[PDB]
Amino acid sequence: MDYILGRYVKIARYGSGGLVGGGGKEQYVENLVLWENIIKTAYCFITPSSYTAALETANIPEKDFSNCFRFLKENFFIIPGEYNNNNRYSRNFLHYQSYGANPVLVQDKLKNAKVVILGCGGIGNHVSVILATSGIGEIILIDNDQIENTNLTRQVLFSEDDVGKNKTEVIKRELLKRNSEISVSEIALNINDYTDLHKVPEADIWVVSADHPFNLINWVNKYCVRANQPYINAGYVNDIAVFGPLYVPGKTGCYECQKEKENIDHKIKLINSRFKPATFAPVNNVAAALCAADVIKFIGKYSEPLSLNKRIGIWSDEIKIHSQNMGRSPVCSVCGN
Amino acid sequence: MDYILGRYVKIARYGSGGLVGGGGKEQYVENLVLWENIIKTAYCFITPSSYTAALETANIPEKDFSNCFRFLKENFFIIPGEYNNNRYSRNFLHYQSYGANPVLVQDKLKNAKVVILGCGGIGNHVSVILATSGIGEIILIDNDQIENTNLTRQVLFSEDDVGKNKTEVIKRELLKRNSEISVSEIALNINDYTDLHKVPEADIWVVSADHPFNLINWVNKYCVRANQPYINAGYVNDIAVFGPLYVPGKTGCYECQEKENIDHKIKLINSRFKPATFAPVNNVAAALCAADVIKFIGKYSEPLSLNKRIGIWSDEIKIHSQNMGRSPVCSVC
Amino acid sequence: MRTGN
Ligand SMILES: [Zn+2]
Ligand SMILES: [Zn+2]
To answer: What domains, with CATH codes, occur in chain A?
Structure first.
């Protein structure tokens, strides 16, 4: 029944009292008397100790030490001594610990996971490297396209030489070169109609990032609603990084839920058919990173993925993030009544 | 004087009228008729045409047309045909969407020298983005060897690289992706305020390193005594962070805005600190840091972190910036 | 933010 202060907690005299912990969990306590007692209690836990073995070394009243202990424990500033077991994924461990999770356990869930990356352009490139190096067991690369030179902007795993080769091929080569303890596989396919979706295997989650055709997302959705298959969308609209929704069968809203005359209508169609995204690495990467963060959480099960029932957008030309509601609707034409 | 519609514009029927543009420029138009008129004039520029011409082309009232033209030109949905000319091709629509001549922006970048003071997580990511975007010369600064525990964030390193010098590998991997760029390495680690002098002069310094702790305070004060621009980037566990971007005589910096018993425990506990790394957070901070460098050097748009330290949460939907503009009462400026 | 990803 040992507890130990996590190495990720930093304290700091601030304002009247002080700060405890860093990041999203940072707590500000105004009462100097209390803040100081928390510091004294935490100090007693630097070495794996039990509640009592720690109180004995404390020079404060058992009542206070107790309130300080409760503080530290709920915010996960102190965690079970067992959660501290040189590994290649050692870095990620502190992260999981900070969320009250068991590193080992989490890592275990990732290893037994199978993830599918649909469309290996800019998004699937970054998502796959994050997932691969984080410990995802199997990755299925689904893309029947070829590397060009103009692709060397957001596709971080490619070198010019690779030009002419298959994306799915180069990614695997590059993924294994970074983590040989996982398995990668390719599927020469390109979702053209709705029928092609049957060609994609079953898996913990599907990362859908390719943007073609216009209503590709809509078929992946439709299909996945009936296939009870979890999936997450990612991409961008020019300068806006976008990720989500993260669809989960029976516990979340689907893409369609919360959803031009004669000559003008043809003009609309011609201008759009003429559309080509204004790609930009920074935007592509923000979208990929946050998408991957959500896939690791959804699978690791230690914190709530952000894009559950939401389509999130992060701007690049202004400090702004905004999410569109996509919660379950009983009145849905895809998975409703 | 020819004008051409951008490929990055999109349109759709929505609510009462429609949407024109995608991304931050996306504007909703109420008047269904004004919408329809906007697409009608935009239609005359799928293929390049001058003002006068399009006018004698589209059958819309010279009044309504003029309005639609200016609208499209001001939002940059329509640009000078000359701006529509390559390796950095996919980046041209981005600069075009901000009303800049991609070739000129692509040129400012080619003539820039960027220094990456820290080749770990942020360094790796910032470094590959600048290189593949065209930053002409990049100075990689550091004195550490690749480890196994690093393959988690340093997207450039492989298992077969473990042990080698970071700058050595980052440099190889960069030239491998953009063979027309000039990279270089300097085996150095800032251990004291006197180490900074050993760091070259450049358009901007990407301060990624986070050791010692008070390295950013050191750099702030030094960069002011060298009139050197720098942008800090990193993370506070699960919160990505980038900025401020310091620009001599234009913005502010990291300086503007005794009970011995406890202070002991405090120091002892803080010395055991270890950051709670997470690649997603790392990547976001680096992506945005790089977007700011590319903008600062390309002048086509305002960097987001000018006078500001931005934070992007990861366990919560939230972005927040701590303003810190110029200030007189400072220990550096 | 009102179109494809
Ligand atoms: Zn539904
Ligand atoms: Zn100052």
So the answer is: 1-87 (3.90.930.70), 88-337 (3.40.50.720)
The whole-angstrom separation of Cα B166 and Cα B157 is: 8
Q: Which is nearest to B315 in space by CA: A315, A95, A239, A323?
A: A95
Query: How many A/B residue pairs have CB atoms within 8 Å?
Result: 275
Separation between Cα atoms, residue B232 and residue A320, nearest integer Å? 20
Q: What is the rounded distance in angstroms from the CA atom of residue B329 to the CA atom of residue B331?
A: 7
Technique employed here was X-ray
SS3 content of chain A, % helix, strand, coil (to 5): 35, 20, 45
| Listed residue (B314, B120, B289) closest to A296, CA to CA | B314
Considering only alpha carbons, which residue of chain C is nearest residue A236?
Answer: C5
Report CB contact under 8 Å: B151, A133: yes
> Are B317 and A316 in contact (CB < 8 Å)?
no
Task: Spell out the residues 6+ positions from residue B163 whose beta carbon is closer than 8 angstroms to its own.
Answer: B145, B146
Tell me how close the Cα of A222 comes to any Cα of chain B, in angstroms. 22
- Exposed/middle/buried for B118, CB within 10 Å: 0-12, 13-18, 19+? buried
Residue in B154, B153, B192 with CA at minimum distance from that of residue B170: B154
Judge contact between B48 and B54, C-beta under 8 A. no
Across the interface, of A95, A282, A286, the residue whose CB is closest to B276 is: A95
DSSP state, A269?
H
With H, G, I as helix, E, B as strand and everything else as coil, classify residue B332: coil
- Report which of B82, B167, B275, B222 is spatially closest to residue A21, judged by C-alpha positions: B275
B290 interface with A at CB cutoff 8 Å: yes
Q: How far apart are CA A243 and CA A26, in angstroms?
A: 26
The answer to whether B208 touches B189, Cβ cutoff 8 Å, is: no
The structure was resolved to a resolution in Å of: 2.6
User: Which amino acid would we find at residue B290?
Assistant: A
* Phi and psi, residue A184, nearest 5°: -125, 145
Contacts of A87 (CB under 8 A, 6+ apart): A93, A107, B149
